[PDB]
Amino acid sequence: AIAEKYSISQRTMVAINRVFGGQMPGHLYTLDYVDPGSEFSFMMMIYNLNLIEGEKDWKAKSVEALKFLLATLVREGIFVGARKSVGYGLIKLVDAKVSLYKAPDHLVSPVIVKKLEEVIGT
Amino acid sequence: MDLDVITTVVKIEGKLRNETLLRVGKGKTQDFAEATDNPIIKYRDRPLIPGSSLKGAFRSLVESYTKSLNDSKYYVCDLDDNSCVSCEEKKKIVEGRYCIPCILFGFKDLASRVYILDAIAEKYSISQRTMVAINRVFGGQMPGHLYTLDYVDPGSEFSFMMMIYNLNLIEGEKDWKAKSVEALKFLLATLVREGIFVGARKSVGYGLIKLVDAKVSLYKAPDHLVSPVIVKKLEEVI
Amino acid sequence: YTFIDKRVIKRTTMIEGDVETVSPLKIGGGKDNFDPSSLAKDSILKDVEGRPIIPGSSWKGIFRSTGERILRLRNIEVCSGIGKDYCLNNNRKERDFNSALKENVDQALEIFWDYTCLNCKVFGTMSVIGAVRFLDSLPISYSLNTRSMIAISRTEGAVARRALVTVEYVDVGSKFSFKMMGYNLPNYAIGYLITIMKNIHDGFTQVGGHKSRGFGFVKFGKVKFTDLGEKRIGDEDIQVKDVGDLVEGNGDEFFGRMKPFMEAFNNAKIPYPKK
Amino acid sequence: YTFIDKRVIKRTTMIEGDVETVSPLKIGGGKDNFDPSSLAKDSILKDVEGRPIIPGSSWKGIFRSTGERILRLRNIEVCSGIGKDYCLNNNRKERDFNSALKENVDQALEIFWDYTCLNCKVFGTMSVIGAVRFLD
Amino acid sequence: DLLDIATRIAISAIKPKPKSNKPEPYVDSSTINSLLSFLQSRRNVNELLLYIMRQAGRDEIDEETGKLLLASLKDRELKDAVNLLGYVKWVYDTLTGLKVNYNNVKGVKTFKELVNILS
Amino acid sequence: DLLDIATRIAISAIKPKPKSNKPEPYVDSSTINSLLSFLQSRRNVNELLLYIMRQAGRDEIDEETGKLLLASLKDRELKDAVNLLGYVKWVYDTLTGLKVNYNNVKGVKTFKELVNILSK
Amino acid sequence: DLLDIATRIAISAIKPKPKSNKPEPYVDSSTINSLLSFLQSRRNVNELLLYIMRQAGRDEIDEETGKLLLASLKDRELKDAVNLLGYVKWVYDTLTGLKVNYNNVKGVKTFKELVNILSKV
């Protein structure tokens, strides 16, 4: 994923306190952050799983798990990157296009292009 | 300890009302929006409290609470100590000594289970205060130590959001790795009623945040993780 | 020991009360920044709502100055706290504390305990935080009034008017909420703080801008004292009579209630600095 | 040298007295406004409760002028304590005093004890607080 | 909001004083400062209205400016009143310093109009 | 662009103060910092313009400088206003620290021309 | 190329700072890091020029070095400016770490010349 509109910022933090309460110069570090409001080009491909039509047997459970993960990503979001305790790194999928292809007939163009919002919740 | 099985997801979202004027530092960098050599940190003309500072203050308060507990089962270890472990249970039995600050805010050998976001401001207002010293001999003279500091207005909302994993608060844990829920509840009660002290001066009263109200939403994995299970106001929790 | 150790909070003391101005108080502030809330002319360090809050920083400075005066009266080695430190940089043993900061934390604790003044431990000097914390004062029944000292008088000569000046003060009878908190404060330190407060209350010490002209004189009419935690902190503390936890009342009876603390502080052999 | 050094207060003198007006008294109220229920247009300085207080500034000025007259009678040199005319400026020792302020305090004390008058060392001068405080 | 009222009041007050040998405002800044100080000290809106009426009767405030002040302070709270008085003082200071002429500024209703004029 | 306006207003404000013992700018940096602080504290443009006008009436601000500031900030958003004020403060600080002579910057209208003049 | 410009800029910035009781260059590594961080965060060249001018006016950046920086960073792309600043930072760090005397290094105007000087001794 690459952010077409990225904004990189730096925030140094000494962040050291003890019984005395001062700052020890040894513990001092600086970090670089991409500011919120940067959209990353995201693409994911899944093979032999009907996220729209649905599946059966173990494939049904796999599709259900994928749907759960996608719903969590879209609504709640997923932390990834630096220290997750401090709120650094939380991605959220804004809008997604799901294009389903069935071999060997419909492979030139997808049969259905549906919003992921209408797929995760039905 | 156990972190791969996410059982309980607790989300607290509320407004941090700054009681007294607050000043957070920065790396002395320069920007057009400020005219002071040591201004406060902000993102695009929006003063905010970094999540790191809140994490540090909470960790310090929880460590003080744990050491005041004065029990051998719960200990606090040095940040730079390489011989500390989060848990040291031995079967002499099932008795083991745990580290509540290590359990909550993590350690070098264990990640933190309490995610703390930042807190941007909405109805903020930057105020500058100039303080100068008084020479003890010939009282009244200003020896040129005239330093002006930037502050936030006394009272401004802040977007607070915190995530807690594998620690049921509404229902609580029966006895397994307990006294951590109690420590978290004590910290939350102190934040809500009294409010912790954060900031740059923190001794002349500069910096006293307080959480006015926050909905506590509990998300459980098995039944429905996206859909909240129980949503309650933070006041009823404590 | 516990006095300098901030890892464990064994005692919390809270002195909260109202302050009444019996003199035309003026704290000043912003003399070079005439950007008020469109109220009179001279800024007096008031919030954007137009309320003239008394700065905590002023309260501290006042407390430290009064304590330095008292300690030097009692023959206690206390320096200034502006461009230097109590001993430390003033002492030969400056970099020793910095070296002991990294390792041997107990050694650093000891260095501080034996090589600092009382105000160092109660207010903090360098890379340390004082055991006490002041807060700002919120006016309750504040009233603003101006006064002009444009008068240059006879000037010991012929001219009776050469310059002009006017000031804006806080009129008498105003009420401010005063609160301060202390951590791991021993009995003698609390008694010394009460002594400072009593010196302020009696009028021997004044806070404001035109102190020489009799502008700053404040008194306490209702002050609460809540003590939570242990009763004694260090081995040097004097076992005071148990006055309870909630101490309050009018200013005179309040200071009459804190008599054991001041008496203990006066009757306390202060070990540090060793020198 | 305790007179100048303000670090330690080795003594405290306080005078409480009553002032009875043998003659009529008029302390100028600024002659610019009559906010309270006064009598004439040129109102005297009064409290918001109507109490006609006497400013401490007036007491300080009266005492300073009377002391100037007394010292002039006693043929003792004295500063004016007003404007740009104080014997710190008159003796051209202001720069040395300012340097000594950052430098060793003993030099500053010696300067302020040797090259200084009495009125502007008692009531105070520029960048130095006076020993005496006048209330209203 | 309050700025428009303050500008109207100040413009009404700055009109030239009749039978005056000098081109001076009908009311001086001393009166404005007195009003603000009276409000700050007495802290009673009714007393402020009485003082304004007395100043108007003393031929210090022209009747139109007095009417404007009374209408704009008839039933206002103390904080709003002090804010409006401070705005009036600042606008009067601006007009006095800029030495504006009442004959080319009388037809001002809003603060933005004053800004446009001062351009 | 905002930077051109900032350079023009700073140039107008760097004019020598008439009737002064020493060659100094007619407008001081304290005034600019006060403008920034007032805008940050009040968070509105109307009373900011009022303060600018009051300062201009009380000297310390050139009449043309005040006119340019009023024209620039006549209709601007809060963020745009603070950006412009920060740019103005930085440009004025550069001019003061460089001790640039006014007579050599009387003809600059953009920011690029000023940059070229400073570089050369 | 860009490396020669960077070397000349670093040499100008490494001249000893007068009225300083300790031997040190006129500028500090903190200034260079601030320059890079400001350029990265603001993503604008004119703002970088303003930052350079203000730093020069703060009596902490040599006026000749500031003139060189302004001359180089005009009519120049953002990527080229970033590359030039990175080269300047690296050359300055190398000179600081090697403790190269300014007296025997001010006479070189080519990166290859500096490389030869470092390699020879």
PDB file of N, CA and C in Angstrom, chain C residues 102-134:
ATOM      1  N   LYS C 102      22.694   7.551  36.928  1.00  0.00           N
ATOM      2  CA  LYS C 102      22.651   6.366  36.077  1.00  0.00           C
ATOM      3  C   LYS C 102      22.531   5.094  36.909  1.00  0.00           C
ATOM      4  N   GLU C 103      23.512   4.839  37.767  1.00  0.00           N
ATOM      5  CA  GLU C 103      23.543   3.648  38.600  1.00  0.00           C
ATOM      6  C   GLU C 103      23.683   4.047  40.062  1.00  0.00           C
ATOM      7  N   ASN C 104      23.413   3.084  40.945  1.00  0.00           N
ATOM      8  CA  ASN C 104      23.432   3.295  42.393  1.00  0.00           C
ATOM      9  C   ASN C 104      22.444   4.397  42.786  1.00  0.00           C
ATOM     10  N   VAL C 105      21.168   4.087  42.553  1.00  0.00           N
ATOM     11  CA  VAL C 105      20.104   5.053  42.804  1.00  0.00           C
ATOM     12  C   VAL C 105      20.078   5.451  44.273  1.00  0.00           C
ATOM     13  N   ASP C 106      20.350   4.500  45.168  1.00  0.00           N
ATOM     14  CA  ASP C 106      20.403   4.826  46.588  1.00  0.00           C
ATOM     15  C   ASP C 106      21.519   5.818  46.885  1.00  0.00           C
ATOM     16  N   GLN C 107      22.651   5.689  46.191  1.00  0.00           N
ATOM     17  CA  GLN C 107      23.737   6.646  46.375  1.00  0.00           C
ATOM     18  C   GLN C 107      23.303   8.048  45.968  1.00  0.00           C
ATOM     19  N   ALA C 108      22.599   8.165  44.842  1.00  0.00           N
ATOM     20  CA  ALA C 108      22.081   9.464  44.428  1.00  0.00           C
ATOM     21  C   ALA C 108      21.086  10.005  45.443  1.00  0.00           C
ATOM     22  N   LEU C 109      20.245   9.117  45.951  1.00  0.00           N
ATOM     23  CA  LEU C 109      19.264   9.561  46.959  1.00  0.00           C
ATOM     24  C   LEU C 109      20.076  10.150  48.100  1.00  0.00           C
ATOM     25  N   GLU C 110      21.107   9.435  48.519  1.00  0.00           N
ATOM     26  CA  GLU C 110      21.863   9.911  49.692  1.00  0.00           C
ATOM     27  C   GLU C 110      22.485  11.246  49.329  1.00  0.00           C
ATOM     28  N   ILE C 111      23.000  11.363  48.114  1.00  0.00           N
ATOM     29  CA  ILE C 111      23.713  12.626  47.809  1.00  0.00           C
ATOM     30  C   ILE C 111      22.689  13.734  47.990  1.00  0.00           C
ATOM     31  N   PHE C 112      21.485  13.529  47.474  1.00  0.00           N
ATOM     32  CA  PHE C 112      20.516  14.638  47.572  1.00  0.00           C
ATOM     33  C   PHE C 112      20.216  14.881  49.038  1.00  0.00           C
ATOM     34  N   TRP C 113      20.004  13.816  49.797  1.00  0.00           N
ATOM     35  CA  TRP C 113      19.564  14.041  51.194  1.00  0.00           C
ATOM     36  C   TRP C 113      20.615  14.827  51.955  1.00  0.00           C
ATOM     37  N   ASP C 114      21.891  14.527  51.760  1.00  0.00           N
ATOM     38  CA  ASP C 114      22.890  15.203  52.620  1.00  0.00           C
ATOM     39  C   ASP C 114      23.451  16.458  51.964  1.00  0.00           C
ATOM     40  N   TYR C 115      23.083  16.751  50.728  1.00  0.00           N
ATOM     41  CA  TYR C 115      23.730  17.934  50.116  1.00  0.00           C
ATOM     42  C   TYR C 115      22.689  18.876  49.512  1.00  0.00           C
ATOM     43  N   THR C 116      21.606  19.162  50.233  1.00  0.00           N
ATOM     44  CA  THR C 116      20.583  20.089  49.772  1.00  0.00           C
ATOM     45  C   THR C 116      19.987  20.821  50.965  1.00  0.00           C
ATOM     46  N   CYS C 117      19.359  21.957  50.682  1.00  0.00           N
ATOM     47  CA  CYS C 117      18.629  22.714  51.684  1.00  0.00           C
ATOM     48  C   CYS C 117      17.185  22.229  51.755  1.00  0.00           C
ATOM     49  N   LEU C 118      16.468  22.707  52.774  1.00  0.00           N
ATOM     50  CA  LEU C 118      15.083  22.285  52.957  1.00  0.00           C
ATOM     51  C   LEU C 118      14.217  22.711  51.780  1.00  0.00           C
ATOM     52  N   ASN C 119      14.402  23.943  51.303  1.00  0.00           N
ATOM     53  CA  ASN C 119      13.613  24.405  50.171  1.00  0.00           C
ATOM     54  C   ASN C 119      13.926  23.610  48.912  1.00  0.00           C
ATOM     55  N   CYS C 120      15.125  23.032  48.822  1.00  0.00           N
ATOM     56  CA  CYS C 120      15.422  22.144  47.705  1.00  0.00           C
ATOM     57  C   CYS C 120      14.479  20.951  47.701  1.00  0.00           C
ATOM     58  N   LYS C 121      14.285  20.334  48.865  1.00  0.00           N
ATOM     59  CA  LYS C 121      13.440  19.151  48.934  1.00  0.00           C
ATOM     60  C   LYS C 121      11.963  19.507  48.856  1.00  0.00           C
ATOM     61  N   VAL C 122      11.577  20.691  49.331  1.00  0.00           N
ATOM     62  CA  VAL C 122      10.159  21.029  49.348  1.00  0.00           C
ATOM     63  C   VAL C 122       9.693  21.693  48.055  1.00  0.00           C
ATOM     64  N   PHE C 123      10.610  22.224  47.244  1.00  0.00           N
ATOM     65  CA  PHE C 123      10.243  22.923  46.024  1.00  0.00           C
ATOM     66  C   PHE C 123      10.941  22.411  44.775  1.00  0.00           C
ATOM     67  N   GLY C 124      12.003  21.625  44.908  1.00  0.00           N
ATOM     68  CA  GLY C 124      12.726  21.146  43.747  1.00  0.00           C
ATOM     69  C   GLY C 124      13.704  22.175  43.225  1.00  0.00           C
ATOM     70  N   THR C 125      14.895  21.735  42.823  1.00  0.00           N
ATOM     71  CA  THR C 125      15.916  22.646  42.319  1.00  0.00           C
ATOM     72  C   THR C 125      16.302  22.348  40.877  1.00  0.00           C
ATOM     73  N   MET C 126      16.685  21.115  40.566  1.00  0.00           N
ATOM     74  CA  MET C 126      17.178  20.785  39.235  1.00  0.00           C
ATOM     75  C   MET C 126      17.036  19.287  39.039  1.00  0.00           C
ATOM     76  N   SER C 127      16.356  18.889  37.965  1.00  0.00           N
ATOM     77  CA  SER C 127      16.067  17.488  37.669  1.00  0.00           C
ATOM     78  C   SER C 127      15.314  16.801  38.803  1.00  0.00           C
ATOM     79  N   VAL C 128      14.697  17.583  39.689  1.00  0.00           N
ATOM     80  CA  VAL C 128      13.917  17.061  40.800  1.00  0.00           C
ATOM     81  C   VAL C 128      12.637  17.875  40.914  1.00  0.00           C
ATOM     82  N   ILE C 129      11.637  17.281  41.557  1.00  0.00           N
ATOM     83  CA  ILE C 129      10.335  17.906  41.741  1.00  0.00           C
ATOM     84  C   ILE C 129      10.091  18.067  43.234  1.00  0.00           C
ATOM     85  N   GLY C 130       9.611  19.242  43.627  1.00  0.00           N
ATOM     86  CA  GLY C 130       9.351  19.496  45.025  1.00  0.00           C
ATOM     87  C   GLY C 130       8.212  18.659  45.567  1.00  0.00           C
ATOM     88  N   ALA C 131       8.231  18.474  46.886  1.00  0.00           N
ATOM     89  CA  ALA C 131       7.214  17.672  47.547  1.00  0.00           C
ATOM     90  C   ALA C 131       5.866  18.371  47.625  1.00  0.00           C
ATOM     91  N   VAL C 132       5.794  19.653  47.280  1.00  0.00           N
ATOM     92  CA  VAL C 132       4.557  20.417  47.360  1.00  0.00           C
ATOM     93  C   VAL C 132       4.194  20.909  45.967  1.00  0.00           C
ATOM     94  N   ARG C 133       2.908  21.198  45.773  1.00  0.00           N
ATOM     95  CA  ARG C 133       2.401  21.685  44.493  1.00  0.00           C
ATOM     96  C   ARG C 133       1.327  22.728  44.764  1.00  0.00           C
ATOM     97  N   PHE C 134       1.504  23.922  44.208  1.00  0.00           N
ATOM     98  CA  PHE C 134       0.506  24.969  44.337  1.00  0.00           C
ATOM     99  C   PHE C 134      -0.442  24.951  43.141  1.00  0.00           C
TER     100      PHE C 134
END
